[PDB]
Swiss-Prot record, chain A:
This is Polyubiquitin-C. GO terms for cellular component: cytoplasm; cytosol; endocytic vesicle membrane; endoplasmic reticulum membrane; endosome membrane; extracellular exosome; extracellular space; mitochondrial outer membrane. The keyword Kinase does not apply. Keywords: ADP-ribosylation, Cytoplasm, Isopeptide bond, Membrane, Mitochondrion, Mitochondrion outer membrane, Nucleus, Phosphoprotein, Repeat, Ubl conjugation. Ubiquitin is encoded by 4 different genes. UBA52 and RPS27A genes code for a single copy of ubiquitin fused to the ribosomal proteins eL40 and eS31, respectively. UBB and UBC genes code for a polyubiquitin precursor with exact head to tail repeats, the number of repeats differ between species and strains. Belongs to the ubiquitin family. One of its GO terms (molecular function) is RNA binding. It comes from Homo sapiens. GO terms for biological process: modification-dependent protein catabolic process; protein ubiquitination. Residues 1-76, 77-148 form the Ubiquitin-like domain. It comes from the Eukaryota. The gene is UBC. The keyword Cell membrane does not apply.
Curated annotation (Swiss-Prot), chain C:
Interacts with TNFAIP3 and IKBKG (polyubiquitinated); facilitates TNFAIP3-mediated de-ubiquitination of NEMO/IKBKG. Interacts with polyubiquitin. Interacts with MAPK1, SELPLG and PIK3CD. Interacts with IRAK1 (polyubiquitinated). Interacts with MYD88; the interaction is indicative for participation in an activated TLR-signaling complex. Interacts with TAX1BP1. Residues 2-60 are annotated as: Ubiquitin-binding domain (UBD). It comes from Mus musculus. The chain holds residues 464 to 531 of 647 of the full protein. It is found in: Cytoplasm; Nucleus. Inhibits NF-kappa-B activation and TNF-induced NF-kappa-B-dependent gene expression by regulating TAX1BP1 and A20/TNFAIP3-mediated deubiquitination of IKBKG; proposed to link A20/TNFAIP3 to ubiquitinated IKBKG. Involved in regulation of EGF-induced ERK1/ERK2 signaling pathway; blocks MAPK3/MAPK1 nuclear translocation and MAPK1-dependent transcription. Increases cell surface CD4(T4) antigen expression. Involved in the anti-inflammatory response of macrophages and positively regulates TLR-induced activation of CEBPB. Disulfide bonds: none annotated. Ubiquitous. Abundant in heart and skeletal muscle and expressed at lower levels in thymus, liver, kidney, brain and intestinal tract. Disruption phenotype: Embryonic lethal. Mice develop an inflammatory disease with characteristics of human systemic lupus erythematosus (SLE), including the appearance of immature granulocytes in the peripheral blood and development of autoreactive antibodies and glomerulonephrititis. This is TNFAIP3-interacting protein 1. It comes from the Eukaryota.
Length: 148, 67, 68, 150
């Protein structure tokens, strides 16, 4: 089975699925191809909202069908990043985000290259290959950004 | 017209999604206010401890002088 | 019907934009509040250090006395 | 003259108006009827965003016309109200809202009657007829609600 996913913008993509695939798996597939976290995705078919636990068969979705993706304004987990100049930015993150993923999000918002960013939490500079969960960085934790 | 019909139903979903998102953000700000209020209580207790201990230092010095 | 659906299209689009603007303002207020929380945490740290110091001074003053 | 005001929710209310009522006056009628402050109200007729300072006559709005009400989820100023049990209530207010108005908003949100409410700010109990600006109550100030139970 091969399916289209389309937003309210001109954006459309194609996914490799099976009729047994749950909507949550479809969201994981969208994350893999597109970088959109599942908790920021709402999938729609025939004007109704598809529940994460149901299969594609439960909504009578066939191959060459078009699912509609509406992006949320936020996910479940935010962290705050404070600069030396007293500016705060908030990032939409997941606990599985790596420190390099977080730095890329900061580059997205503020234009600062990742190699010039030092992130600090609880007095420790954070290593690029580790995740937020590795440092026990919780929802609404504040990291400190210092520039090289 | 059917293209228009679909866009209105997606837009309706987007309205409901965006209100949910706002309500979560509001809920998070309320909980943050509660956290601020708890810290303000800690500051108050701590300020009280500073005034007491400062006062005890001064009177110890005065009590010792008086002997 | 097409004029009726375009009407609803317009009103719905406007409702979405307003709700997105409302969200961004709520988010900005939440950021500011974090900043205020962080300054309160610095105040707590500072005050805890003052209490620790004055407690030590009190103990020391008493030992300086007994050393007489 | 009696017009209709329709939310995208599907809620239709019916208002008693006069032509050349300012849109501001119509928004006040909506706040008396529903829970909604005028700064969270945006009225639309014939694809035109209706301005507060202009009038029903201005917009060719005839006797039983229907207006479309688009809603904001918040206005410009919020205050927090903390209960004795640890719960927070966020209220959408204006600096010239009276303490009476604040208690009425708490009623609309939580169902607690106003003569049961005592509001406290900065260790002072707040007087019904005075305003938020009178007490130096700023945006994001926290008031404390204590109930008077007889």
């Amino acid at each position: 089975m091969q399916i289209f996913v389309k937003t309210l913008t001109g954006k459309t993509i194609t996914l490799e699925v099976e009729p047994s695939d749950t909507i949550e798996n479809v969201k994981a597939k969208i994350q893999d191809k597109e970088g959109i976290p599942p908790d920021q995705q709402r999938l729609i078919f025939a004007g109704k909202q598809l529940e994460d636990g149901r299969t594609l068969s439960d909504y009578n979705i066939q191959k060459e069908s078009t699912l509609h993706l509406v992006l949320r304004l936020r996910g479940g987990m935010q962290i705050f990043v404070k600069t030396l100049t007293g500016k705060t930015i908030t990032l939409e993150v997941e606990p599985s985000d790596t420190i390099e993923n977080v730095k890329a999000k900061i580059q997205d918002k503020e234009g600062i290259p990742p190699d010039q960013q030092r992130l600090i939490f609880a007095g420790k500079q954070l290593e690029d290959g580790r995740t937020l969960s590795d440092y026990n960085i919780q929802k609404e934790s504040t990291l400190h950004l210092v520039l090289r | 017209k059917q293209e228009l019909v679909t866009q209105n139903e997606l837009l309706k979903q987007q309205v409901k999604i965006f209100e949910e998102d706002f309500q979560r953000e509001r809920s998070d700000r309320e909980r943050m206010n509660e956290e601020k209020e708890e810290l303000k209580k800690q500051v108050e207790k701590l300020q009280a401890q500073v005034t007491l201990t400062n006062a005890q230092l001064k009177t110890l010095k005065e009590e010792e002088k008086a002997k």
